[PDB]
Amino acid sequence: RGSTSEVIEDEKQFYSKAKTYWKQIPPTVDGMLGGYGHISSIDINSSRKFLQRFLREGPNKTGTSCALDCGAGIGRITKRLLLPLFREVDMVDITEDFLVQAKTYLGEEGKRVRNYFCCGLQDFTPEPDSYDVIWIQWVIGHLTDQHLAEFLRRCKGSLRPNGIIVIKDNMAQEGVILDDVDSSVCRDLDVVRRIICSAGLSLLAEERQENLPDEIYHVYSFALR
Amino acid sequence: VPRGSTSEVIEDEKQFYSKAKTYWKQIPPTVDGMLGGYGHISSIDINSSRKFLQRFLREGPNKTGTSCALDCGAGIGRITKRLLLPLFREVDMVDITEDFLVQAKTYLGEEGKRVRNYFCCGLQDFTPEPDSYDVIWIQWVIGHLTDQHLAEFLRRCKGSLRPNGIIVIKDNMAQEGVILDDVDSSVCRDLDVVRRIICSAGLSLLAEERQENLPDEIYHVYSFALR
Ligand SMILES: Nc1ncnc2c1ncn2[C@@H]1O[C@H](CSCC[C@H](N)C(=O)O)[C@@H](O)[C@H]1O
Ligand SMILES: Nc1ncnc2c1ncn2[C@@H]1O[C@H](CSCC[C@H](N)C(=O)O)[C@@H](O)[C@H]1O
C-alpha cells in the first residue's frame, strides 16, 4: 500500500487506539523509546550535530530564542537537545500524564518551558511567527497523510525568519505499513518527501541515522522550511 | 527428564519464600521494577488483557459483574490503575511488599480512592472473603507459590467469587517442565503442569490465550479464564 488511506480502515479508531496505547505507557525514557532507552544518547548526539549546523552557519542563521517539541512525551529531547540551545521551549503532546511527568523530569531547566500544550497534532495550531525550530520526532506515524500535510503547513506559518522544521522518524523500505500494536504507520522516503512537498516546504538537508541496531527501521532526519 | 512439580526443584520451602520476600524488598516501586526491566511492554499487556476480559463482561446468562475485583500480587497497582479501576466500581489489592502498597497510593492517583482494601500478605496466607469478587486477577506471581500453596490459594479464590465470577491467571509458561529462578526465587511451569494445578483446585477453563507481540527472548505468556 502507498498511502495511509489504503491501510487505515477506520480513521476515528486509528486516533483513539493510539491515544489509549500511550496513556498506558510508563512515563520514562525507555517507555518513550519502546525499550530502546539505551540508544537515547546516540540519537540525541546525532540530532545535536544535525541541528547545530543550522544554528551556527550563516548567512541567514537560524535563531535560538524559542523551539517547539512536537509529540514531546516526557521531554527526552526537550531536556538534552532543546533546552540547552534555546532560551525557551514549548511542548505539545496528546498524553497529559507525560506533560505532568515532564515538570519533574526536566528539573530546574524545565522552568524555561514556556507552554505545555496537551493536544493531538492533528488538532494543534502553533502560534504564527513564534519558533526558530520546530522538532517533530517519532510521531509523524500517528497522523494521516492529509493531517500530516496540513499540520506541516501550519508549522511553516509558525516559523520565525530563518526558522526550520526538523522531522526525525522511522522510514519504511517501501510503501506504508500499519503497526496495529501502537496504531501508527511507517512510510517510505518517497511518500514522506511527497507529503513535505504538498505542505509547501523545501528540503534543506536529509541524513540517515547511523549506529542503530540492525533490527529496527531506518531513521532519517529532514530539515525543512 | 523434565521436572513435573515444585517438590522436585525447591530445596527448602521456608527459604524459597524468604528469599523472594527479600528480593522484592530491594526492587524500585516503579512499572519497570514490576516488569523486570520490560516496563515498556505494559501497554501491549494491558490492551490484550482488556480484550481478553471484556468477552466475559458481555450481557448474557453468564455475564461477569463489575462491582469488585481483586488484584493479586498487585505491586504498585499497574494493572489496578490501567485495567481494573476503569471497569470495576471497587478494587482490592494484595501484595507481600509493603512499600509497593504505600507507593500505590501515589501511583494510582485520584482513581485510587476506589481501591478499598490494601492487603499486605503472602498469597499463601491470604483467604479472600467469600462471595466478594466478580474478577480475581492473578498476574506474574503464580511462580512464587509452591504447587500445594497455589492449588490451595485457587481453591480459596474459588470460594470468594460472586455468581458468574471468574479467576484470570496471566503468567509465564515454560516450554517443558518446572524451572527454578534462584535470583528472584520463583518457578516457571509448563502448560501441562499449570493445567494440572488448575484442575486439582476444582476449576475449569473458559478460555486460554497466548500473549502476542512480546520480545522473542522472554518466556511465553498465557492467559487463562477460570471458574
Ligand atoms: N496525535 C498525536 N499528537 C501528539 N502527540 C502524539 C499523538 N499520538 C501520539 N503522540 C505522542 O507521541 C509520542 C511518541 S514516543 C516519542 C516521544 C518523543 N518524541 C521522543 O523522541 O522522546 C508519545 O509521547 C505520545 O504521547
Ligand atoms: N508470595 C507472594 N504473595 C503475594 N505477593 C507476592 C508474593 N511473592 C511476590 N509477590 C509480589 O508479586 C509481584 C510480582 S511483579 C508483578 C506485579 C503486577 N502483578 C503487575 O503485573 O504489574 C511483586 O509486587 C511482589 O511483591
From Swiss-Prot, chain B:
Alphabetically, the GO molecular function entries are: histone methyltransferase activity; N-terminal protein N-methyltransferase activity; protein methyltransferase activity
> Consequence of mutating residue 181 to N?
Strongly reduces methyltransferase activity with CENPA
Which subcellular locations apply to this protein? Nucleus
Q: Which family does it belong to?
A: Belongs to the methyltransferase superfamily. NTM1 family.
Q: What does this protein do?
A: Distributive alpha-N-methyltransferase that methylates the N-terminus of target proteins containing the N-terminal motif [Ala/Gly/Pro/Ser]-Pro-Lys when the initiator Met is cleaved. Specifically catalyzes mono-, di- or tri-methylation of the exposed alpha-amino group of the Ala, Gly or Ser residue in the [Ala/Gly/Ser]-Pro-Lys motif and mono- or di-methylation of Pro in the Pro-Pro-Lys motif. Some of the substrates may be primed by NTMT2-mediated monomethylation.
Q: Which UniProt keywords apply?
A: Acetylation, Methyltransferase, Nucleus, S-adenosyl-L-methionine, Transferase
Any Gene Ontology CC annotation: cytosol
Task: Please give the organism.
Answer: Homo sapiens (Human)
Q: What is the effect of changing residue 24 to A/M/Y?
A: Nearly abolishes methyltransferase activity with CENPA
- Gene symbol here is NTMT1
EC number per UniProt:
2.1.1.244
Top-level lineage group: Eukaryota
Q: Which reaction does this enzyme catalyse, per its entry?
A: N-terminal L-alanyl-L-prolyl-L-lysyl-[protein] + 3 S-adenosyl-L-methionine = N-terminal N,N,N-trimethyl-L-alanyl-L-prolyl-L-lysyl-[protein] + 3 S-adenosyl-L-homocysteine + 3 H(+); N-terminal L-seryl-L-prolyl-L-lysyl-[protein] + 3 S-adenosyl-L-methionine = N-terminal N,N,N-trimethyl-L-seryl-L-prolyl-L-lysyl-[protein] + 3 S-adenosyl-L-homocysteine + 3 H(+); N-terminal L-prolyl-L-prolyl-L-lysyl-[protein] + 2 S-adenosyl-L-methionine = N-terminal N,N-dimethyl-L-prolyl-L-prolyl-L-lysyl-[protein] + 2 S-adenosyl-L-homocysteine + 2 H(+)
What the entry lists under CDD domains is as follows: AdoMet_MTases
* Binding-site residues for S-adenosyl-L-methionine, renumbered to this chain: 73, 78, 95-97, 123-124, 139
Q: Which Pfam families match?
A: Methyltransf_PK
Lineage start:
Eukaryota, Metazoa, Chordata, Craniata, Vertebrata
UniProt-listed PANTHER family: AD-003 - RELATED (PTHR12753), N-TERMINAL XAA-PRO-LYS N-METHYLTRANSFERASE 1 (PTHR12753:SF1)
Matching Gene3D superfamilies: Vaccinia Virus protein VP39 (3.40.50.150)
Q: What is the effect of changing residue 186 to K?
A: Induces a strong decrease in methyltransferase activity
Q: What is the effect of changing residue 171 to A?
A: Does not affect methyltransferase activity
Q: What is this protein called?
A: N-terminal Xaa-Pro-Lys N-methyltransferase 1
